[PDB]
């Protein structure tokens, strides 16, 4: 996260760290959506141009974390993957369309003050909240500039009109994506960055005061560049696939 702030303790209890077993390193962000399901970006797990194709056995999920590097005895929980599920129309060849994946844990994780699932939006919450100018929150242990933080970082960013999103890049953007960030003129700034991948873009519904995951950190050109915006997987648009996976293999 660049131009973010240190998270408060328990401010993002759905935040998940995807962790490589060997060599032990952060791989990506992710999010807890139930006691046994973790949501992330597909590119975190599969990305052939960079020879990335992780199997279950290569990874661990660490939940309830605050510190990037420390092992948080009595706080974090570390879980094993039972199975990975990648969107069958995930477009790694062209633009990361449908950049979304699910991970089922071997065993249910115990909720705590530091570990708690986020909600996934229904259509009406999505329609109410995914509006240009409405701010969301992005969290991550990713790089601080286009170099890593000691603790979980947080940044609030306004959703950006689709025409401005499109006009900022040469990439083909789809209905399964949205972009967020300040414009050059708005003065303030901030962005997700490498390592923030697969982490959640959340919004607090003013209707029932619950936190919803509206996006997934997907891609950008650089990090926090003027005239550029971060791109996010549109969770509600891929909701049907999510339900299906969890219904079938639940």
């Amino acid at each position: 996260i660049v131009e973010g702030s240190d998270a408060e303790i328990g401010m993002s209890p759905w935040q998940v760290m995807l962790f490589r077993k060997s060599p032990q390193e952060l791989l990506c962000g992710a999010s807890l959506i139930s006691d046994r399901w973790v949501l992330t970006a597909a590119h975190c797990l599969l990305y052939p141009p960079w020879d990335k194709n992780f199997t279950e056995n290569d990874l661990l999920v660490r939940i309830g974390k605050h510190s990037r590097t420390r092992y948080e005895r009595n706080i974090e929980k570390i879980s094993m993957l039972e199975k990975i599920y990648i969107h069958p129309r995930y477009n790694w060849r062209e633009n990361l369309d449908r950049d979304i994946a699910l991970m089922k844990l071997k065993k249910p994780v115990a909720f705590s003050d530091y570990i708690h699932p986020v909600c996934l939006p229904d259509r009406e919450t999505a329609a109410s909240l995914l509006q240009a100018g409405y701010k969301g929150r992005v969290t991550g242990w990713g790089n601080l500039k286009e170099g890593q933080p000691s603790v979980l970082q947080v940044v609030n960013l306004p959703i950006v009109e689709r025409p401005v999103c499109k006009d900022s890049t040469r990439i083909r953007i789809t209905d399964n994506m949205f972009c967020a960030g300040y414009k050059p003129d708005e003065g303030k700034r901030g962005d997700a960055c490498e390592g923030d991948s697969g982490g959640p873009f959340v919004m607090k519904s003013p209707f029932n005061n619950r936190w919803y995951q509206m996006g997934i950190v997907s891609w950008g050109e650089g990090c926090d560049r003027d005239g550029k915006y971060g791109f996010y997987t549109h969770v509600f648009r891929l909701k049907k696939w999510i339900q299906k996976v969890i219904d079938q293999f639940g």
């Binding site: 962790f19 060599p23 032990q24 390193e25 952060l26 661990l60 660490r62 590097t69 420390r70 092992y71 570390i78 094993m80 890593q148």
Partner: peptide, 10 residues
């Protein structure tokens, strides 16, 4: 590498 070692159990 920069990371504290997690319990071998994991």
């Amino acid at each position: 590498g920069d990371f504290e070692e997690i319990p071998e159990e994991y």
